[PDB]
Design a protein around this ligand. Structure first.
Ligand SMILES: [Cu+2]
Length: 108
């Protein structure tokens, strides 16, 4: 978790909306089973993609305002931001390989 940005309602603007480049935000909660595998994959992704992609987490139980703003309906949900705007989303569990091709799909 050393390479994952911890987001809240109060840091989201600065850390995501005003951030240059790509940020992958993981919307999660402790009660979400599928979110645990997502977390392990994301640690590897954050490491492998350092300097190309920032990875972050937003707990929806603790930050319902942000969850509502982005229309989160179920978790896990991954939101990919580029220069402060939503570029892509993926709802529900996926494999590491699938996440890599989802990321590749969003290359300029
Ligand atoms: Cu870590």
């Amino acid at each position: 978790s050393d390479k994952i940005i911890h987001l809240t309602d109060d840091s989201f603007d600065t850390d995501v909306l005003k951030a240059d480049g790509a940020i992958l935000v993981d919307f999660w909660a402790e009660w979400c089973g599928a979110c645990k595998m997502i977390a392990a994959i994301l640690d590897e992704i954050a490491d492998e993609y350092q300097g190309k992609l920032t990875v972050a987490k937003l707990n929806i139980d603790q930050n319902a305002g942000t969850a509502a703003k982005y229309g989160i309906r179920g978790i896990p949900t991954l939101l990919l931001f580029k220069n402060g705007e939503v570029a892509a989303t993926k709802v529900g569990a996926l494999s590491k390989g699938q996440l890599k091709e989802f990321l590749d799909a969003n290359l300029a």
